[PDB]
Structure 1
Amino acid sequence: MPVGWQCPGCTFINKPTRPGCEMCCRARPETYQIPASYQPDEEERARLAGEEEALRQ
């Protein structure tokens, strides 16, 4: 049932927008495309919003 990018190292399926594997730290495959239709959970949305906050400052 998970949705996202499979880490080819450990097979954990990661949130599309996470840059590295939540389990084993391996980097997201460069070929995976974040879907435009992905709707992140509140924690991940807030994380990204934080990053977006930093840029404007």
Structure 2
Amino acid sequence: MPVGWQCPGCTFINKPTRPGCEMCCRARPETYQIPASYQPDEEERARLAGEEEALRQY
């Protein structure tokens, strides 16, 4: 059982941090909350780090 948000459209369970469904592009449900303990796979981890770096100025 993958941990993440079920897309109510296609039923795929998505990475907690993805803005839309990896299969069908539908938006992430409003009230779903990230796990207390989320450890993203290496690719998603790098994606998230990149987005943070882009917001930062140093």
Q: Does 1:20 find its partner at 2:15?
A: no
- 1:35 Cα deviation from its structure 2 partner: 1.4
Question: How many Å separate the matches in 2 of 1:51 and 1:30?
Answer: 21
Question: How many Å separate the matches in 2 of 1:36 and 1:47?
Answer: 19
Give me the TM-score of the superposition, normalised by structure 2.
0.92
Matched residues, number: 57
Unaligned ranges ≥5, structure 2: none
Question: How many Å separate the matches in 1 of 2:2 and 2:22?
Answer: 13
Give me the TM-score of the superposition, normalised by structure 1.
0.94
Question: How many Å separate the matches in 2 of 1:51 and 1:36?
Answer: 21
CA root-mean-square deviation: 0.8
Unaligned ranges ≥5, structure 1: none
Question: How many Å separate the matches in 2 of 1:31 and 1:42?
Answer: 26
- Give identity over the alignment, percent: 100
User: Greater CA deviation, 43-52 or 30-39?
Assistant: 30-39
Structure 1 stretches of 4+ with a deviation exceeding 2 A read none
